[PDB]
């Protein structure tokens, strides 16, 4: 299914994923599309920070859901 990953700066990434994919796998797909190292990615859905070892389905993430990607952005 398709999900969207939107940074807090307004950059939107489209991913192809399965409900059984882990958060780690999603971070790896984000790295493949936009070159962000997974250890710098903080993913948020429904206000909760997504944990590496869990699946998308554990957070009730459905088709066309949007996840928020929080990056440490230095001033």
């Amino acid at each position: 299914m398709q999900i969207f990953v939107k940074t807090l700066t307004g950059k939107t990434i489209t991913l192809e994923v399965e409900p059984s994919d882990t958060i780690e796998n999603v971070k790896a797909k984000i790295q493949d599309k936009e070159g962000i190292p997974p250890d710098q990615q903080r993913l948020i859905f429904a206000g909760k920070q997504l944990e590496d070892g869990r699946t998308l389905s554990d957070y009730n993430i459905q088709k066309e859901s949007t996840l928020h990607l929080v990056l440490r952005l230095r001033g």
Binding site: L8, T9, G10, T12, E34, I36, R72, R74, G75
Partner: protein
């Protein structure tokens, strides 16, 4: 009668028009406090007021999200910029240089000197700055050194592709470019204290 010599009028007209742009972005109707805070920040090159905590990140999203559909300037907001700067009939190159200098100013807003800190930066201001730069690129790619330099600055704003993120450096870099290639436009945009 002109009360200012020609080369000094920019020092008065620039701050006027920047204030009008701030009134457009941060409505006094709904956002009077942040409106004042953005205006006050133009008065010196250092701010003790920071907008990096979760509440400030949320407040700025409220303000900028309507202006940045899909991460780009909305058509309506872009027209409002053109009107405020009297650029509706101007060349795409003049429009692009103005938008580049506004991008630089909002890069500075996001930096450690103003509302950001060493380690953090208000993402909405970074996104707005990058969208201004994107529109300038669309209007006149030739005002940039290269497509590669555009992409470097853009990746830095968003933290993509392993790029560094420090916007004090990003803003300094774009400001150096504007000072070299269109310093009069830069003088017309940048708050005096930030020059």
């Amino acid at each position: 009668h002109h009360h200012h010599s020609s080369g000094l009028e920019v020092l008065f007209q620039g701050p006027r028009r920047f204030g009008e742009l701030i009134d457009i972005i941060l409505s006094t109707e709904e956002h009077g406090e942040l409106n004042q805070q953005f205006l006050a920040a133009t008065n010196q090159k250092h701010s003790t007021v920071k907008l990096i905590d979760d509440a400030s990140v949320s407040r700025l999203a409220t303000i900028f999200d309507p202006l940045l559909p899909e991460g780009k300037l909305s058509p309506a907001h872009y027209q409002h910029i053109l009107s405020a700067y009297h650029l509706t009939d101007a060349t795409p190159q003049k429009q692009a240089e103005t938008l580049f200098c506004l991008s630089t100013a909002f890069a500075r807003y996001s930096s450690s000197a103003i509302f950001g800190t060493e380690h953090d930066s208000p993402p909405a201001l970074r996104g707005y700055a990058e969208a201004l730069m994107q529109k300038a690129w669309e209007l006149s790619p030739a005002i940039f050194p290269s497509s590669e330099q555009f992409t470097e600055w853009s990746d830095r704003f968003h933290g993509l592709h392993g790029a560094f993120t420090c916007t004090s450096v990003v803003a300094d870099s774009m400001q150096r470019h504007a000072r070299k290639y269109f310093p009069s436009v830069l003088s017309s945009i940048l708050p005096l204290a930030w020059a």
